Structure formats: structure tokens, C-alpha cells
Design a protein around this ligand. Structure first.
Ligand SMILES: [Br-]
Ligand SMILES: [Br-]
Lengths: 1093, 84, 164
């Protein structure tokens, strides 16, 4: 064999790094083809660029992953006899196919003329194309970014030429993937024929400049009817791509933190749960410290742990809060006086909290800390603990002291006062306990200071502040920014705006909501004690000073009692991800909404969840849908009738819409539990054995997997029709079960399904004659063995999927016996014509009365044991049908209207399908992905405001896709910044369909403020069905910060006046964030988005 | 428009073009090898291939079972089997 | 590919003349199987008589005719990936198939016990057997006359062993 070594460290192979797929370098399929092409021409004596070839039956058996160093060896071999070749890489097959040098390369090509470009939507540019691909998982780079141009449907386009066949042929595959509707990762599986004509290729390239070859490129064509990709000298027929596995991304979902006003003196726990309340108290404390550490990049702290359990210390949590803050790292240590270092060090673990050994009595634990945490420090009899804690912090440092309330009151405050400290904050920890944040006070009298008005009536107050900040440094003074009773100034935003200014450390914000209050003054009794704390943020709300702090939300996976829900596998790899999800409400024909009581799991559900089966295989448009699990169910009709049904999907829910054609009314003496087992397995058995196979009495049939769902149903019907039955079983217990359960099943006729032994058994018992039918769900060597069991005029009935999917080879000698091979897909029935559906149900219907249709044994699981239910079926020890008990059946087994129930499911908010949704700046990157998400959540009326209009092909693409999905898209190009424009937008949009939501986007890349201001104002009058008013943006330019402050206030004010209003402060990330935001209620006026990506 | 050439594989393109990728419901085939594999590709959903040739059958040629994903049937047809 | 030469003028390959069919020498199907078996052990490192194998999907595409001189070259090739092999003779494919070294050679066999000889009629001797075959066209000679005995229906019998 020929060995070919490629090393990405070398210049010639370096380009291969450009073919990155899902975060890893993959040796391109076209790479293999080139290797086969090159080496084959070499041994023939010619140069490969001088040698035309025809490749056939190309199979790409597995992907080849390369590292950075990437020294990988490819082994190639050719058969002189047939021309079959193979490429091996790591002692395992990589690629196979056939290659021959044709008589006439011109005669091997198809006479195809160029297609007329599609003008349905704007064409895609190079950047549009690869933006699209990026979202699917393709991370192409370098020369592999060779698609210069493509029309909106990718029927025609252009590919550049850089004297590189691998990259060029790859872009042909990229181009074919564009036309695919499903936006997921596809990798080549097969190519039926690949005609390469080098002579023709270069004489076409000669007609182009070296520049044109790169800037303009070569035409590429995609003919969907004949399945051909043609560009210049390369012609590709019969391309097959399979959906690939996506690596379990290391991107944690985003969390949301809500802002709220926290009084310095708060006598109410921050949470209902005492433990969570304490954690919040600590979170607030560290926040205040960070807020008042000027521009500190490192935050130093310690925790006194004398007479405490190593486990209960909070050090880890503190460092975790610190580290959480952007561009900030923490130096947290645990101080111990009891010299039990080894014990303590183990408790902290992999947190990275150091341990210092010092006796807090008589000496300082450490120098220049930002804070010191301690419990019962003011309780101690001696003040020495406190004293050395004070000596350990820097002058403006803090003390976080957890104390018992009774003690803290009678002596605690005096002790702090005695040592010159003031209680900056007091947060209750239930009753009998309190968290106290202490600090040395500052003297307002002795230090120079000046005040800035910070009002909206003066437009230039920002320059006044800037001028003051610069002067402040020189003049050794502090600046008080006073903002009393002003609109469009949110305290949080305004604070951030000040902090980031040059010399901002010298500023102090005095924010007063109520306009009726003592004027700002250092002397006033109201302000004096407060401003003596020297906090940069001071907010007065209803007589109480405080700050705006962001609290971590508890609902990462919270469960609310909903009325309607379905089961979903959130991450395919892990079955623990199976959870109930709240379903959208319903807004006909030959349909019926039923109440689900029993929903069985079938292998298709397992295969889908596990990922062994891709989504593209799912019938119709299910690959798009979220709710796909559930193939059948037993339940109640709209009129409370006892019914069992069969559906393509969505039966694994509290309710399901079933087709009347595919429904049976449950008979008496059948429990819903029993009935649920019948629809699928028996519809399958009858469509296979009676319709397709046309089985006759006295014939011999081989039913594989006897003690399985389909097997049991098959054996029952077959024996009922009078056939001689052969079967196989997976184990001793499975053997025993069948024997005892059925009428005249011969032990002689039960083989073993684990191996091929059943072949000898059947041939022996049939004296070489074989059987007339085979119902097969086995694969590979067991399938070919089953073929050998087929006798004259036999009829093979395949209900498995492996060999079909893998396109395994079938020896056609079997057909000499006047036989038939039947691919049997029940899905095709339900997806197919109607009469076939009506016949199969008739067969099942007729069968039940005959007694041929018997319900199967059941392994029942309740709504909470869905995980165990799936894992149990996957194992394969189960006999019969696995059923989930959604509802307990009412007693008497008669017709009856169902009692209402609630089920615990992850809450989920859907859009209203008869409302409009305005996205200001909706055609920007953020806007497009937001719109898409709304569409998947049920939005059917979209309004996008854009001054420039459609600019990119990608934009036109998304609009085309939304319109094809039946969405009404309006591009409003009017000036929304004015009052008249905003008013007009809202009135037109409302007339299209009542506005349900308004989304303001400052994230795309003041006018930002004024549009929101007017949109807010007029929507109150016009939009009476508005559910959402959301403003997106990033944290912290000085004018951008002020735009945030304004939007913050707008949303706060809206809520005050009883309107929806939410400010969101910080494209795979968008969808992830939106899911969290709408996962349950989120009524706070401002939220912080924490990224973990 | 519906008359192709039996000498080559061109009839595949003709049929797929005229059926817009749908294919046909039945194929009565007496061709072999590359022309047989091409006739398979002409088979549409729920299609039914009807073989009356013998080459690939005798030679035990391999048949890609992917075609059966389309809910199709392959029929070995020997008139002799009827009379016997 | 690996080239293997057999010359019936040579002592080791002379016996092949015994496999005469219809008045001409044919390279036996089992000849190819052995050649494929032998060379496969060679590249695997072992001796063929110490190396168990499992062949699959063997196809004998055409007969190979030799004259008396019979100097013929066989070209053999193997795919490391699948185990597929091909033997070509005189510029054309002769035999194809698959060959693999099993995990457990004993497990690849069938659990079969000897059959009870048929007593419907007298057993066949070596001369009875090959008299019958001669009439059918098989002109076996030398060591290829290795059927010592067979029952009337040829369900059981005996074959001699001459280290070949
Ligand atoms: Br690839
Ligand atoms: Br032979």
C-alpha cells in the first residue's frame, strides 16, 4: 500500500487548518478524493493534473480529526481487477470507493447549461454565506472560505480558485449544504459519482485573470432534480450528507440577576429561605465594598474562624462573589488561632483560598485588607479581637460582622461607636441575628467639596462634572453629584457613568427620588450621618437611604404547576435531561384534541433522545419542532370517550391532537393501560404481514425478537391466521415467557437472537425449504443470515433501520428465488395517503374482536419516573410495552369528562400568534436572531424598523425563511426618533395586528433615548394588549452610559404607572439568554445578564 | 419527452427531470449493472422495482439497501416460478 | 500487489495437473483459496499452517486454464481495512473475497456431530466414486482422487490426507 503523510506544521499542508468543523480540524472528504486522485495517477505514470479520473461509490466511513502538530499517516491501496480503492489512517478504514481512467472524459460528463439566478431575495455575499454556515457549526477559514457568491436558494453561485483542488472541491460541498433547509451540521457520507476533468478546468481558468479567479471565481450549479453539483471541471452526482454529533459545548447557560433597592438598614430578610437570605446578605455586602474600593483590580479579604466548623466558613462564597465581578480577582484567606491548619485547608478544597496561621488576640491577622469577616466579634468579652481586625484593614476598609441581634443592640453598636466605627449597613438574618457592615466615618467639615447639579434642565451638566473631576484632583476635593427628582436618570446607570470618568474615584452620588426633601447639604441631619459613610452611591427612597444591588435568581430549573406540558430531552447525550415543559395554548378539520392518560415509549423515542437517530429522519417538519416524543397513547376524547390512538409525534404530553382516521374506541375489559400498548405494534404488524407481505394460512414465518413489542404482536396475529411460526429470543427468561403465553408455539421453533444459530435451526426444521416470510428487526450478519432462511417465493419484511441507513450491500442472488424485499416504514403510512391509513386501522379494528389483538404486558412509570422509564427500555430486559402513567384512569372504565390536573413542568412563555412584535433596530445582528426566536415561540407578525433597510443577503435570507414559514414581516423605514414617527409606527403596527411586545435595541452598531421615550409614551395610549416593553444594551463613552440610565428609568417609571417594562443589560448567546428571560415570570424593571461562555 | 436511451445511463436524468425528483411508482427492468443502479435511483417513494433480468441476480450483484428507506419493494420476477 | 508463480514443471506444483476438468487442467478454486490463505499469513508474519482464518463471500469469476508447461503468475492484493482480497491472473480478475483472523477460531465453527451413514444402499468405494464423476466430466488424477469412501447419498464419507 501507499503511505501518505500530512503534517500541518509544513507549509504545503498548513491550509488544512481552515477546514475547522465544530471547533476541531477535520481532514476534508475532498482531501481524501485528492489523495486517491493523486497517488492513482502517479502509479499510472502520469501527473494528476494531467490525468482525468472518474470516482464512484465514494463512502466516507468516519471523520479524521487533526490536532495542531497533526502528524497523521494515510494508507492507500488499489485493486488492479475492479479498481476499488481504500484509505486507512489509524489502523482503521477511512474512505472507500472506485476509481478508473475513462476512455473519453468528455463523454463521462453531463450536458448541463447554467441556471438563471434566483431573484426571490437578495443574493448572499461571501460574508453572508459563512455567517449562515457558522451558525450551523462550520468554522471555515482561509482558502476554505472560497464561496464568493451564492443566490438566496443556492441554486447558482461562484467559487474562487487558488490553485488548490481540495479547498475548491470542498466549497462545492459547502455550496450544496447551503440549499439544505435544516440549519444543522451536516457531514458528507456518500458520493455516487465524481467526474474530474483537469484539462477542461484549466482551459476555463485561462479565460480568467489571476485576480478574477480569486475576486470573481468560477460558476457553481446545483440541480436539485438530478442531484448534481457542477463547477468547471468537477462534476458531483448523488451527494449524501448525514447529520453529525455536536460536541457537548462548554458554554454554561447565562444567568439573570434582578436589581432592587436595598436599605442600608434592612429589617426584612432578602429571601424567604433563611440560608439563601444569608448568602444574599453576603452578596450585598461584597457588592458595597467593591462599589467603594475605587478602581481596585484586586480585592483582599480574610475570614476569622476561631471556634467554628471548617465546613460552615463562608470564605469560598466570598471569593466566588469577588471573582464573579469582571476584571477583578480576590485574595481571600482563612485565619485560624487554633492552629488546625491541616484540617481547615482540606475543607476549603479546590477553591484557592489560602490559610494564614495567627492568633487574632494581641496581633494583626494581615495588613491592608479591603474587608474582614467575623462572627460574634462584638459578642466577645474582650475587644482585642475587634482591635486587631481594625488594624488589619486599610483606612477605608470594611468590617463584615455577623452578630446576634439582642447582643448587637444592647452593646454591639456602642462598641463600634467606641472604636470610631459606624454601621454602614444592617441586614437582618432572620430574627436574633444581623449582618453588619462597618467602616470608619469621614468628616464632611474638614475636607473640601463642591456640588454638581446633575439636572435635565441643564444639558451641559456633564461637562460641569468633567471639569469638576479634573479640577478635583488638583484642588484636593471631593465632588458630590446631586440628582434630586429627575426623570431619565436611573441611579444604577448614572453611577456607572460617573465611576468610569477620569477622576471618578473622587465623586459621590446623592440620588433622591422624592423631589420634596431637604435640599442637599452636608449640615442637614438627614444627609450628614449618611454622607459620613462616604459611599459613592446614596439612594433615598421613602425616607430610607440605600443602594441598588443585583441579586442572583434561584430559578435555573424551577418547576411550576402548569396545566399543559410535554416531555423534552434538552441535551440528547444525557437522559437525565428528560423533563416536562410547559406547552403553548391552542388558538378543526379531521382532528381531535384528546386528554392523555397513558403514553408508551417506543424505540424511536429512545433512538431520538440518545442521538443514534438524527432529526432529519423524523417525518415531515418535526426536525424543526420541540415537542416530538410520543407515538401513541390511550386517553379520553373531547367528549370523554375512552380512546386509543396513533400519531406521528407529540403523544407524550398532557394533551394530544389525534387524527380520527387513526383512532380506535377502547373496548370493555381493557384498561387504558392495556389499550395503550396496541396502536403502534399492531398497526405495524398488520401493515407488514397482511398488506405488504400478504401472508396466507399454512405458511411459515420467521418472527425475530419474539418477546418484543412488535414480535409479540406479530406472533399473536400470525398464529391467529394459522401460520407456522419460528422465532428468536434474547435470553432464557424471554424464552420461558413466549412458550407459556402462546397457542402451539414449538420449542423446536425458538432460536437465539444473540447469534446466527437460528439459521441452522430454521433450515433444519424446514429441511432446507426455508420460510415464506421473514419479519426482521435484526441487522448485519444476522440479517444476511435471515436472508438465507428465505425459501422460494419468500417475502422479506424489514422493519429495522441500521442496514437501510448504512446502505449495506444486499446480495441479489436471493431474488432468483422469485422473492420480494420490503422496506417497511410505518411513518410513511401516517405521512402518506389516507386510504392506506383507513385500511390498517380496519385490520387492527377487525383483529381485536377476533382475539388476535391482545394487549401487551406493561412496565408502567409515573410522570416523575420518565428518566427511569427510558433507561429501562434502553437496557432491553423489558418484555412488552413500556408505558408512562400521565393520569390514573377513573374507576368503572366508562366514558367520563376528566377532572382537571396540574403537572410540574419547567415554565415557558410563548408569543401570541395574533399579535405583532416591533423590534427597533430589528435588522441588526442581535435583532435578526431575536426575531427568529420569537417566531419559534409562536410570533406570526413581525415589524422591523431600519433606516437603511435590507443591506445584507443574510437579512433577506432570514426574511425569506420567516415568510415561507408563514410570518408577516414588515420593514418600517420611517424615522422613529421623532414623536410623530414613533406614533405612526405604533398605529400602523397595531392595525396589522395588536402589538404584544416592543423591543428596543441599542446593541446594534441621544437617538437611542428619544425613540424609547416616545415609544413608551404613545404605546400607553395605542397598544392596549402590549405584554412586553424591553430595552437591550451593554454596561458602560459617557453618553452610552447615560442612555442606559435613561432606559432604566423609563422601564421603572412604566412599572410604577402599571405597565410592562424591562431593561436587559449584558449569535448563540442571544437564544440562550432569551430562553432564561422568558423561562417563567421576570417582573423586575432592570436585569443583569451574566455570561458563562 | 418520455422516451430515453437504453444504451447509456442518461435516462436517469431524463426521468428525474420530468418527474421533478419525485421518481416513478414502478420500474419494469431488463437492464443490468450501471444501468440497473441508475434505474433504482429513478424509484420514488413507495416505489416498486420489478426485475425481470438475470445478470445481476446470477452474478449476485450487491444492492444498496438505502433505497428501502423510501418504503419501497424489490421484486424478483421469474415466470417459470409461476408454472412450476 | 504480491506476485505468486506456479510452474507445473516444478516438483511442488506438479500435482495441479491432477485437477483436470473436461480434458483440460483448471486451477482449482481451492488452489486460489490456499494461495490467498498462504500469502495472507506471510504478510501477517506467521506460517500458514499455524494461522487460522475465516474467508467470506468468495467469488470465482472465471476458470483458469493451464497447458502442460503451465507457468502462470497470480497477482494477489489485500485491503488492511476490510480484509477484502483479489487475485488476478493474466491481466484479469479471477477470484475475490474477504479474509480475517478470528478472535476465537473454535467459536467460528458450527456445533455439528457426525451423521449416521445411510444404509439405503451399498457404500461407494474410491473406484465407484470417481467412475461416477468421470462420467460427469471430471477427470481427476493423482492426489485429487482423495475420496476413499462415501455412503450412497454422499451425506458421510472419508477423504485421504497427503499433506496438501
Ligand atoms: Br468533510
Ligand atoms: Br474448481
Amino acid at each position: 500500500e501507499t503511505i501518505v503523510e500530512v503534517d500541518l506544521s509544513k507549509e504545503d499542508d498548513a491550509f488544512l487548518a481552515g477546514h475547522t468543523i465544530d471547533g476541531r480540524i477535520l481532514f476534508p472528504a475532498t482531501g481524501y478524493m485528492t489523495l486517491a486522485w493523486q497517488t492513482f495517477a502517479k502509479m499510472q505514470g502520469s501527473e494528476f493534473h494531467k490525468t482525468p479520473v472518474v470516482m464512484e461509490n465514494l463512502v466516507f466511513h468516519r471523520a479524521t480529526i487533526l490536532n495542531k502538530n497533526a502528524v497523521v499517516k494515510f494508507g492507500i491501496n488499489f485493486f488492479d481487477g475492479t479498481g476499488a480503492f481504500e484509505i486507512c489512517e489509524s489502523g482503521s478504514l477511512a474512505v472507500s470507493g472506485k476509481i478508473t481512467i475513462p476512455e473519453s472524459i468528455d463523454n463521462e460528463e453531463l450536458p448541463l447549461e447554467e441556471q438563471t439566478p434566483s431573484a426571490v431575495a437578495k443574493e448572499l455575499g461571501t460574508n453572508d454565506v459563512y455567517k449562515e454556515l457558522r451558525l450551523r457549526g462550520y468554522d471555515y477559514g482561509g482558502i476554505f472560505r472560497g464561496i464568493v457568491r451564492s443566490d438566496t436558494v443556492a441554486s447558482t453561485g461562484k467559487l474562487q480558485w487558488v490553485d488548490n483542488w481540495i479547498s475548491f472541491m470542498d466549497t462545492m460541498l459547502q455550496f450544496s449544504i447551503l440549499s439544505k433547509n435544516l440549519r444543522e451540521l451536516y457531514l458528507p457520507t456518500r458520493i455516487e459519482r465524481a467526474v474530474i476533468n483537469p484539462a477542461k478546468h484549466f482551459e476555463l481558468l485561462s479565460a480568467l485573470t489571476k485576480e478574477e479567479q480569486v475576486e470573481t471565481g468560477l460558476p457553481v450549479q446545483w440541480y436539485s432534480d438530478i442531484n448534481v453539483i457542477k463547477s468547471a471541471g468537477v462534476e458531483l452526482r448523488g451527494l449524501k450528507a448525514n447529520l453529525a454529533q455536536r460536541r457537548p459545548g462548554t458554554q454554561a447557560p447565562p444567568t439573570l440577576e434582578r436589581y432592587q433597592f436595598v436599605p442600608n438598614i434592612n429589617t426584612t430578610d432578602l429571601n424567604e429561605n433563611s440560608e439563601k437570605a444569608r448568602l444574599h446578605a453576603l452578596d450585598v455586602a461584597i457588592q458595597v465594598i467593591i462599589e467603594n474600593s475605587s478602581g481596585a483590580v484586586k480585592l483582599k479579604g480574610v475570614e476569622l474562624a476561631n471556634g467554628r466548623n471548617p465546613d460552615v466558613l463562608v470564605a469560598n462564597r466570598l471569593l466566588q462573589i469577588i471573582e464573579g465581578e469582571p476584571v477583578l480577582t480576590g485574595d481571600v484567606a482563612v485565619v485560624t488561632s487554633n492552629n488546625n491548619e491541616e484540617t481547615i485547608t482540606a475543607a476549603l478544597g479546590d477553591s484557592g483560598v489560602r490559610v494564614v496561621s495567627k492568633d487574632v488576640l494581641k496581633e494583626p491577622v494581615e495588613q491592608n485588607c479591603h474587608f474582614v469577616f467575623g462572627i460574634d466579634v462584638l459578642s466577645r468579652p474582650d475587644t482585642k479581637t475587634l482591635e486587631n481586625s481594625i488594624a488589619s484593614i486599610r483606612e477605608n476598609g470594611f468590617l463584615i460582622l455577623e452578630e446576634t441581634l439582642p447582643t448587637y443592640t444592647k452593646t454591639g453598636r456602642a462598641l463600634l461607636t467606641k472604636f470610631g466605627f459606624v454601621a454602614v449597613q444592617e441586614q437582618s438574618l432572620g430574627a436574633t441575628r444581623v449582618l453588619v457592615l462597618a467602616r470608619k466615618a469621614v468628616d464632611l467639615k474638614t475636607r473640601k467639596s463642591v456640588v454638581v447639579v446633575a439636572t435635565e434642565q441643564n444639558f451641559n451638566w456633564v461637562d460641569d462634572l468633567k471639569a469638576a473631576l479634573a479640577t478635583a484632583a488638583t484642588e484636593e476635593q471631593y465632588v458630590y453629584v446631586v440628582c434630586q427628582g429627575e426623570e431619565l436618570f436611573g441611579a444604577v446607570g448614572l453611577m456607572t457613568c460617573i465611576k468610569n470618568e477620569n477622576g471618578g474615584k473622587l465623586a459621590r452620588l446623592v440620588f433622591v427620588q422624592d423631589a420634596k426633601a431637604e435640599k442637599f447639604s452636608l449640615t442637614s441631619t438627614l444627609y450628614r450621618q449618611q454622607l459620613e459613610k462616604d459611599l459613592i452611591s446614596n439612594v433615598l427612597k421613602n425616607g430610607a437611604w440605600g443602594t441598588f444591588r443585583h441579586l442572583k435568581l434561584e430559578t435555573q430549573q424551577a418547576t411550576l404547576q402548569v396545566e399543559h406540558a410535554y416531555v423534552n430531552a434538552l441535551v440528547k447525550g444525557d437522559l437525565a435531561s428528560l423533563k416536562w415543559i410547559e406547552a403553548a395554548q391552542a388558538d378543526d378539520k379531521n382532528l381531535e384534541t384528546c386528554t392523555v392518560y397513558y403514553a408508551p415509549i417506543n424505540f424511536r423515542d429512545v433512538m431520538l433522545t440518545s442521538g443514534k437517530l438524527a432529526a432529519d429522519a423524523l417525518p415531515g417538519d418535526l426536525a424543526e419542532q420541540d415537542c416530538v416524543l410520543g407515538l401513541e397513547f390511550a386517553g379520553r376524547d373531547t367528549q370523554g370517550r375512552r380512546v386509543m390512538a396513533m400519531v406521528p409525534a407529540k403523544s407524550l404530553a398532557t394533551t394530544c391532537v389525534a387524527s380520527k382516521r387513526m383512532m380506535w374506541q377502547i373496548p370493555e375489559k381493557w384498561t387504558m393501560e392495556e389499550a395503550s400498548t396496541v396502536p403502534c405494534v399492531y398497526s405495524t404488524v398488520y401493515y407488514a404481514l397482511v398488506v405488504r407481505g400478504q401472508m396466507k394460512k399454512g405458511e411459515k414465518i420467521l418472527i425475530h425478537a419474539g418477546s418484543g413489542g412488535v414480535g409479540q404482536a406479530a406472533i399473536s396475529v400470525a398464529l391467529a391466521h394459522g401460520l407456522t411460526v419460528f422465532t428468536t429470543v434474547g435470553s432464557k427468561e424471554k424464552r420461558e415467557f413466549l412458550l407459556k403465553r402462546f397457542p402451539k408455539l414449538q420449542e423446536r421453533n425458538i432460536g437465539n437472537s444473540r447469534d446466527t444459530s437460528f439459521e441452522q435451526l430454521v433450515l433444519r426444521e424446514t429441511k432446507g425449504r426455508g420460510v415464506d416470510l421473514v419479519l426482521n428487526s435484526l441487522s448485519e450478519e444476522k440479517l444476511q443470515a435471515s436472508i438465507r432462511c428465505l425459501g422460494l417465493n419468500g417475502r422479506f419484511l424489514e422493519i429495522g433501520k441500521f442496514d437501510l441507513s448504512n446502505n449495506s450491500p444486499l446480495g441479489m442472488s436471493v431474488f432468483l428465488k422469485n422473492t420480494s424485499f420490503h422496506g417497511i416504514l410505518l411513518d410513511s403510512v401516517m405521512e402518506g395517503e389516507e386510504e392506506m391509513q383507513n385500511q390498517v386501522v380496519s385490520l387492527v379494528a377487525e383483529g381485536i374482536k377476533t382475539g388476535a389483538v391482545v394487549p401487551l404486558p406493561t412496565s408502567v412509570f409515573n410522570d416523575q419516573q420518565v428518566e427511569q422509564a427510558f433507561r429501562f427500555m434502553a437496557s432491553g430486559k423489558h418484555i412488552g410495552k413500556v408505558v408512562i402513567k400521565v393520569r390514573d384512569e377513573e374507576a368503572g372504565k366508562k366514558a367520563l369528562q376528566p377532572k382537571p390536573r396540574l403537572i410540574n413542568a419547567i415554565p415557558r412563555t410563548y408569543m401570541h400568534p395574533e399579535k405583532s412584535y416591533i423590534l427597533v433596530g430589528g435588522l441588526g445582528g442581535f435583532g435578526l436572531e431575536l426575531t427568529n426566536w420569537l417566531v419559534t415561540r409562536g410570533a406570526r407578525y413581525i415589524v422591523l424598523t431600519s433606516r437603511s433597510g435590507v443591506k445584507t443577503g443574510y437579512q433577506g435570507l432570514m426574511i425569506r425563511r420567516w415568510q415561507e414559514r408563514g410570518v408577516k414581516v414588515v420593514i418600517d423605514t420611517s424615522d422613529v426618533t421623532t414623536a410623530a414617527g414613533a406614533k405612526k409606527l405604533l398605529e400602523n403596527s397595531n392595525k396589522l395586528a395588536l402589538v404584544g411586545g416592543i423591543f428596543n435595541l441599542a446593541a446594534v452598531l441621544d437617538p437611542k433615548v428619544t425613540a424609547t421615550k416616545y415609544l413608551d409614551q404613545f404605546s400607553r395610549d395605542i397598544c392596549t394588549e402590549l405584554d412586553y416593553f424591553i430595552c437591550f444594551s451593554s454596561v458602560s463613552q459617557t453618553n452610552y452610559g447615560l442612555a442606559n440610565s435613561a432606559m432604566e428609568r423609563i422601564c421603572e417609571q412604566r412599572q410604577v404607572s402599571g405597565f410592562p417594562g424591562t431593561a436587559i443589560q449584558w449569535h448563540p448567546v442571544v437564544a440562550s439568554m432569551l430562553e432564561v428571560l422568558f423561562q417563567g415570570p421576570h417582573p423586575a424593571f432592570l436585569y443583569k445578564v451574566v455570561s458563562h461562555h
